[PDB]
Design a protein around this nucleic acid. Structure first.
Lengths: 100, 68, 55, 96, 171
RNA sequence: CGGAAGGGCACCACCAGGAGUGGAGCCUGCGGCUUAAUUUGACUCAACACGGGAAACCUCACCCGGCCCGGACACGGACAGGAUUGACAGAUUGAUAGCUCUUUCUCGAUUCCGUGGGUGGUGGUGCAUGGCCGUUCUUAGUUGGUGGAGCGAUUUGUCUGGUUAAUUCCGAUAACGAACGAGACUCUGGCAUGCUAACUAGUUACGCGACCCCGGUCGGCGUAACUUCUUAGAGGGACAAGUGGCGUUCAGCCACCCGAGAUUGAGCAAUAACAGGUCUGUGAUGCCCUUAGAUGUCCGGGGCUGCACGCGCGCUACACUGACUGGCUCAGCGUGUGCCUACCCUACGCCGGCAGGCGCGGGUAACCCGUUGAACCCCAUUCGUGAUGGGGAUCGGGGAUUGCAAUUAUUCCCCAUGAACGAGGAAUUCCCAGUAAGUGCGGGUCAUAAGCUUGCGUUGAUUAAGUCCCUGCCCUUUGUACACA
């Protein structure tokens, strides 16, 4: 009954809406909830050639995506969990449900 | 360009005329006589013969050799 | 022996086993994170994958 | 291009039950991942279907590793004339 | 899922899947006025929205071309039958989607219209639909072998900074 | 264009300095030579650790030999009294390539031969190209409409003076209305004792357990709160904001109080052009060539690693601020089990000095490697000016890893061999505040692997805050017989 909900989204502000929606979605249903943990992001440093050939000066690319993750624990049964996460889902945020 | 060594030729197939006539010998009765030996494999039991050469046998696909 | 000398050479390792997934060329590969992609098309297809140069 | 009748029939039969059937631009693969039951090696599906692509009965399109073949209504009668199929049964992409 | 790939490798594969399937459809759906795609990832179901201009040609024969695209992803990318559903949508204010007239320029050039006359057609349409500015470049071989470049620029346009990322469309 | 002037700017420029290269060793790439290839492209800034190119095979684009057609489709023959695919042996072969050769058993219409023709090519043409990159150009310049001047080409706007990093503005003004570049915009850094959250992190107190004589310690366990240390969301915070001098006192400038910042770094970066490169990144491509005895493909081997020589990017030292041996102690970039894919980071106890091998287990990752006990540097002995305990080039013997395959020592470990090198000439490269530089760790390159490079961490300075002396950049005036300038 200590059900874990994980939020993974590429965007910064889009993940902020959904976690705050689940903050509002847990208080409106009045269940014991552990707060959404603002868990550190990771940057994928991809530094390659800008040039296809070997002619030109040495320039290096700087590619970086900062995937960010949250985890929310609910002290509620499984029926309540599937009611909330199945409504108004966006492409940005992925939802993962862990019972333990 | 130019080629010094002549190319090795493709194997021209030796066509056999009336290949089934040289499988059996005819009798005036209603019987058939078998000259070559059938293969004892599971894939081919009776409809496939073996290459009865002058020194040892061979089957086409299952690769079985009957030496003497 | 055509069917056995065709693929007698192992490709369990080496740089000829892995190539690009568009050009199928065997150079400039970014093997990291299981991309299996040449770097030249990676910059071209950076918008279709997501990669942008913020900083 | 000498291929067995079991490989010959299975290529044409899969093309009729679905309007599409895919392959890969990689000759060095033993079995087609779509059909893991029969042999159907990749060099058979590229070249025997290319006989159908050469006479203009299918749409041809490529996406980075894979050839995509959209069978048209003109090619349905070609499979009907060869595989002896009734016209009542229809491809799944024409089903509504 | 059994092998349990990491999240770092998943969005790389998700970006690859967003790259390959979009690029698969661009070369195939090029005569229909491609404008962009967007896929929704959900449990047990794969919802994808495809945007195009001419909604008459997005279906073919009562949705035959729609159903052909349902089984292509079913066979190559490894998805169950019925787990993916495709919805066709119509374009609003299509004169501001830069790739919409980009192909429209080609079929006039490929069809047999003049390089000269087709160029007026695009710049008239983007002003007719309403644009604050534009940057139309046509380059290549013209009237022979030597490379000639024509650039038709009028209005407001920004080339530097973050405004390039999300305020303009480049085709 | 000016070895014409007036200005402004720049450590790919100077002074003052600092650290280097060119001197020695080794490695990489290039030129030349040679052989069957020592594939090739690239040649001032913009070629020369460049093509991601750290090559036993693949990559390989080259050569030595041999398979195979995947020549589809259409046309004429051909044949079921058989159109064609395959083969145990023995010779040959590099092979258990029936590749062929003397000998026959299997195939059933997929199909063979000739004609159209198709396809493939890291085949050629970057002076046919597109696209991409680099450069012009690290600086600030440019374009439309109306209007004005000139018969016209053309020109104004796009600028005297001040000021700015700037065509930055004030301000004059045949200019006005606009637009781009810079500016603006985005990412990150130190300031947040304030909010949200944190049992995938810690803090404070205690419960015990253990040590020494009430107190001190335990990343030894667990717990009543919290984010001060760990992190990310909204944010706020800097604007010359204020004061005193300089300046039409306007644009603005200098110093100072307080405050984490009174000039942090990076991405993007206007019109237009380069006969710069890439056809060897493309199922992106025009034209030409081959297409059966193949410039298509596959396998085996060799080269791309050769060596009188020259050059460049790099590492190591040339020693006492140093070498060695022990004690010691502090990181965040990161990364980690894969569609095919046959391939993960490793904890622990062990065998062995060692490379390595055997059992289990954690981790798809703030959980585990790991609390990343990383180095120079701190301390204590030996060394003692000796090319010597600096230096490790060369070379021999031995042990395993990766790999089917290392021989040209893949790669590492042990012993031993112990060369030059005494601070490097004419010259030349980079840098001014966590800056040059000393130093180590991640990612790509990887089956085995960093002498390269992108990032990150430790330690961390000398000199200057100026100039056009040299070398380059942008304007104005000026003269031209130049206009591929």
């Amino acid at each position: 009954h200590r059900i874990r909900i994980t939020l993974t989204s590429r965007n910064v502000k889009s993940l902020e809406k959904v976690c705050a929606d689940l903050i509002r979605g847990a208080k409106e249903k009045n269940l014991k909830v552990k707060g959404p943990v603002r868990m550190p992001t990771k940057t994928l440093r991809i530094t390659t050639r800008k040039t296809p050939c070997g002619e030109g000066s040495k320039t290096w690319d700087r590619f970086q995506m900062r995937i960010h993750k949250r985890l929310i624990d609910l002290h509620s049964p499984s029926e309540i969990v599937k009611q909330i996460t199945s409504i108004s889902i966006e492409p940005g945020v992925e939802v993962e449900v862990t019972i333990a | 360009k130019s080629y010094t060594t002549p190319k090795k030729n493709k194997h021209k197939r030796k066509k056999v005329k009336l290949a089934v006539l040289k499988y059996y010998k005819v009798d005036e009765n209603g019987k058939i006589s078998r000259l070559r030996r059938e293969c004892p494999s599971d894939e081919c039991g009776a409809g496939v013969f073996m290459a009865s050469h002058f020194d040892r046998h061979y089957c086409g696909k299952c690769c079985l050799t009957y030496c003497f | 022996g055509h069917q056995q000398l065709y693929w007698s050479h192992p490709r369990k390792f080496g740089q000829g086993s892995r190539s690009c997934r568009v050009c199928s060329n065997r150079h400039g590969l970014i093997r990291k994170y299981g991309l299996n992609m040449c770097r030249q098309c990676f910059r071209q297809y950076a918008k279709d994958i997501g990669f942008i140069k913020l900083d | 291009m000498l291929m067995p009748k079991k490989n010959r029939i299975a290529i044409y039969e899969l093309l009729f039950k679905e309007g599409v059937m895919v392959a890969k631009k990689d000759v060095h693969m033993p079995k087609h991942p779509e059909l893991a039951d029969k042999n159907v090696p990749n060099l058979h599906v590229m070249k025997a279907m290319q006989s159908l692509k050469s006479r203009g009965y299918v749409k041809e399109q490529f996406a980075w590793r894979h050839f995509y073949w959209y069978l048209t209504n003109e090619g349905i009668q070609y499979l009907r004339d060869y595989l002896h199929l009734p016209p009542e049964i229809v491809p799944a992409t024409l089903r509504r | 899922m059994a092998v349990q790939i990491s999240k770092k490798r998943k969005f790389v594969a998700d970006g690859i899947f967003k790259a390959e399937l979009n690029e698969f459809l661009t070369r195939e759906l090029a005569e229909d006025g491609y404008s962009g795609v967007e896929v929704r990832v959900t449990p047990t179901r794969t919802e994808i929205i495809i945007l195009a201009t001419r909604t008459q040609n997005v279906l073919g024969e009562k949705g035959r071309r729609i159903r052909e695209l349902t089984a292509v992803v079913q066979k190559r990318f490894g998805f169950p039958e019925g787990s993916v559903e495709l919805y066709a949508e119509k374009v609003a204010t299509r004169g501001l989607c830069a790739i919409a007239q980009a192909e429209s320029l080609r079929y006039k050039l490929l069809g047999g219209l003049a390089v000269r006359r087709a160029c007026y057609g695009v710049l008239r349409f983007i002003m007719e639909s309403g644009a604050k500015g534009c940057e139309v470049v046509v380059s290549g071989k013209l009237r022979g072998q030597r490379a000639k470049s024509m650039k038709f620029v009028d209005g407001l346009m920004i080339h530097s900074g973050d405004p390039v990322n999300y305020y303009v469309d480049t085709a």
